Design a protein around this ligand. Structure first.
Ligand code: HEM
Ligand code: HEM
Ligand SMILES: CC(C)(C)OC(=O)N[C@H](CS[C@H](Cc1ccccc1)C(=O)NCCc1cccnc1)Cc1c[nH]c2ccccc12
Ligand SMILES: CC(C)(C)OC(=O)N[C@H](CS[C@H](Cc1ccccc1)C(=O)NCCc1cccnc1)Cc1c[nH]c2ccccc12
Lengths: 435, 435
């Protein structure tokens, strides 16, 4: 526990670390309550220790811009190592330094404004499966678990958008990682993997069946100043894209319908805009989705209250002095997204759901280095524009046909998962009525 | 690699161990070819090293009886430690010393001749589901994967026989364990488990739902000179019983139909006996199943060629001198079942399928410490009698309605899985015809 003197040395405040465990006992309320607490206790800058690992929290918008944008390529290029990963080390979210720059370049043109516009005709199909799957549990007044019917939709979208397969989708340990990061190299040599060695084995061969069948995201990889992309590295990117495109889309869509249900005036104000831009229940298109500003305002304000990443992190790969502060090599620099999204020194009534904060009359009084639901700089969420489009296309088709009211078992107020990831404690269950 | 001199010291022959790896590179053809080889090379007794771990192979029937029966309780009480297991350490197949004696006593009366006879009326249902599920893929001349329709049956049997749930069941790393057994205690403290932490979490709560619902194998545990049984220890026994009752029953049943197909004279000789004891396609009963001797002869001879355990093992918990041989504390004593089941110094034409070896005219010329498909002594297969009854009840109802012929894709001869477990390389697929 010799490393527990770094912040005492640097004169940076923070909680006193216990030996070996560091400050991780504080995570007993979740990452987010710990961040919101430390933010209040120490101010703009503090540090703590995930085990022996020093973690410096920064909340200064200038310092955040320095870390995420100005000094990304040079110092803050990678995140805090994750293991064991196995062959998934070559996935873009996990790859480091030059290996990541190459996969970023090769995978970037997948989410152009043009490649997205090609997917709107394809996404529209499963939105109608989503309505019809919802029309069944609606004509029977049985409360609906949203993440089920949303995840069935989100799953349908990601398989075809990246590959082309069409399916009606109705057919405890990481605690030790941070106290035993020295055990990560141990597990890497045992082929153990946080990704099950079966799901990966399924897709590794499934992709090489799809590759040698047509011969989409699967198309653009074999098609492409660097080297070219490999094959086991092609499977790894698909696995990242399939996870994100499913669990992020479904979880946020569930978060949105909970708020639309507990704020019926906003749910009606949005249903009115959807019928105006799309009269006669018109099919949403790429350009109509980009016209609905109150839909974007709802999506944005929901992602303020539930930034599913909670924290942004970068590893300081060498000694730097950013915005007048010395940061030694090896430190993980952390931006507490959840805490800043709820900071009263920037948001009025930050626990209330108020989409009007993002009105064009008010969207200017909002610092983009405080509101970072997708990150910033060269390593932001590569699938941001696709995520916004995917969700918005789902809300339109769903609110065009249904209205949502709370039930007896609806968790009000919603308890967040006091665990790790950002999910609700109890699932989101609402009553669906047909218009 | 200081431990690699033990057998050189004891004057026991065997392959020369490489540093760290021991003799495990020899496993490149499977456990069984290694045993059959070493048996020929060195004779009645040899040793080798799984990593640093000394393993003494014995083939002397007297010495085998000493280890398995005479000296079981005193010296050879447990098998070679298995990890990581987590809460499954309390399962009977895995439990050691006194903890195992208690679970053996508490779980033994589950497989009495009387408790088995109570299950014959219940097993008969899914045998008819098995026929009807087979009548579908038979009236369409589509070759059948036997382990699918057998595993669907074996799964149906084990859930109701132990609990009572009825369902129509149509709705890479252990290599490092033996070079890094010092890593087993490492993994135990990370909650990692060779049993997925999800399947176990499913049944842990599923059982405690069943426990507090009725309030069978599930019945007799809460009902019972020892202490009494726990609850997390109740889930652990269920998991052992469900695995064995599924994968053993299905795999052997597949092995039997492959042989009945490649030896049509035996398949007809057995169909004639089944129709004689059970005329008009009579329903098999507990006592009729025990009357068919040629059915028992087929089952026995199949289990000679494919003893799904391959090896029996016991840990020598203290220095002993058994049958004139010194065996030091810590050594794993191993009986190469597969090798002895194919030893020409005991079997004539041991690669040929010949059920007549087990005729009552010939069943006496067979040493029960050479033919050990279920083990021997106090720690033999506790579910032997149930396994024989379960399989025999399936063969009767299946051969009463169908005959089996090889296909174009039928693997002839059957290659064993050159891996670890005893399975076929390619699945067993045969043509099914309706009588
Ligand atoms: C509501 C939906 C989503 C949210 C809120 C979200 C948020 C984020 C955030 C905060 C980051 C880290 C940014 C940073 O470190 O500065 C990230 C990274 C990433 N996201 Fe998303 N994401 C979403 C959906 C998606 C989707 C649909 C994909 C499709 C593949 C995707 C792919 C990625 C990838 C590949 C990265 C890592 C990129 C890199 O490291 O270069 N995300 N996301
Ligand atoms: C064809 C079917 C089966 C075969 C060939 C088989 C074979 C074996 C063998 C060789 C052993 C080790 C015996 C020894 O070490 O001396 C064993 C142990 C065991 N078997 Fe089976 N088995 C079969 C089916 C079953 C079934 C249906 C069950 C039902 C629960 C079962 C439960 C067990 C248990 C609990 C043990 C460990 C007992 C102890 O350690 O005290 N087996 N089996
Ligand atoms: C330090 C190093 C460079 C090695 O990389 C990281 O250690 N990265 C971690 C990877 S966890 C997760 C792994 C996983 C597990 C099981 C199935 C599939 C994937 C994942 O790869 N997910 C990327 C997809 C995604 C999710 C959410 C939002 N968008 C995109 C954590 C992490 C980095 N960026 C993030 C933005 C948001 C949320 C978590 C992370
Ligand atoms: C040394 C120690 C005392 C600790 O115990 C052992 O290390 N025991 C090993 C356990 S592997 C397997 C584990 C498992 C994994 C995943 C799901 C379910 C179970 C299992 O528990 N299976 C018992 C059921 C069974 C299977 C086959 C035939 N009958 C009964 C190996 C072993 C001991 N006896 C055996 C007879 C036959 C085949 C393997 C073994």
């Amino acid at each position: 526990t010799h490393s527990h003197g770094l912040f005492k040395k640097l004169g940076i405040p923070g909680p006193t670390p216990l030996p070996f465990l560091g400050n991780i006992l504080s995570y007993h309320k979740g990452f987010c309550m710990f961040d919101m607490e430390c933010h209040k206790k120490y101010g703009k800058v503090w540090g703590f220790y995930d085990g022996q690992q020093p973690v410096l929290a920064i909340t200064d918008p200038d310092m955040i811009k320095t870390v995420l944008v100005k000094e990304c390529y040079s110092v803050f290029t990678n995140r805090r190592p994750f293991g064991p990963v196995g062959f998934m080390k070559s996935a873009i979210s996990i790859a480091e330094d030059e290996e990541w720059k190459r996969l970023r370049s090769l995978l970037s043109p997948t989410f152009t404004s043009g490649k997205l516009k090609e997917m709107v005709p394809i996404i529209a199909q499963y939105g109608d499966v989503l309505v019809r799957n919802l029309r069944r549990e609606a004509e029977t007044g049985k409360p609906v678990t949203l993440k089920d019917v949303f995840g069935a939709y989100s799953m349908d979208v990601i398989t075809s958008t990246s590959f082309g397969v069409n399916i009606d989708s109705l057919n405890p340990f990481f605690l030790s990682i941070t106290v035993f990061p020295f055990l990560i190299p141990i597990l890497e040599v045992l082929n153990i993997c946080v990704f099950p060695r079966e799901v990966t084995n399924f897709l590794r061969k499934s992709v090489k069946r799809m590759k040698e069948s047509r011969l989409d995201f699967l198309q653009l990889m074999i098609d492409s100043s660097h080297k070219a992309l490999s094959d086991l590295e092609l499977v790894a990117q698909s696995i990242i894209f399939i996870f994100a495109g499913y669990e992020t889309t479904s979880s946020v869509l569930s978060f949105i319908m909970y708020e639309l249900a507990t704020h019926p005036d906003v749910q009606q104000k949005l249903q009115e805009e959807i019928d105006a831009v799309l009269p006669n229940k018109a099919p949403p298109t790429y350009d109509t989705v980009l016209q609905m500003e109150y839909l974007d305002m709802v999506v944005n304000e929901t992602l303020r209250l539930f930034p599913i990443a909670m924290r942004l992190e970068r590893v300081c790969k060498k000694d730097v002095e950013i915005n007048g502060m010395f940061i030694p090599k090896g430190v993980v620099v952390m931006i507490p997204s959840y805490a800043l999204h709820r900071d009263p020194k920037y948001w009025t009534e930050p626990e209330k759901f108020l989409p009007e904060r993002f009105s064009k009359k008010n969207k200017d009084n909002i610092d983009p280095y405080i509101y970072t639901p997708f990150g910033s700089g060269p390593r932001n969420c590569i699938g941001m524009r696709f995520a916004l489009m995917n969700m918005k296309l789902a809300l339109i088709r769903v609110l065009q046909n249904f209205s949502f009211k709370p039930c007896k078992e609806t968790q009000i107020p919603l308890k967040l998962s006091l665990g790790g990831l950002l999910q609700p404690e109890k699932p989101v269950v609402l009553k669906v009525e047909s218009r």
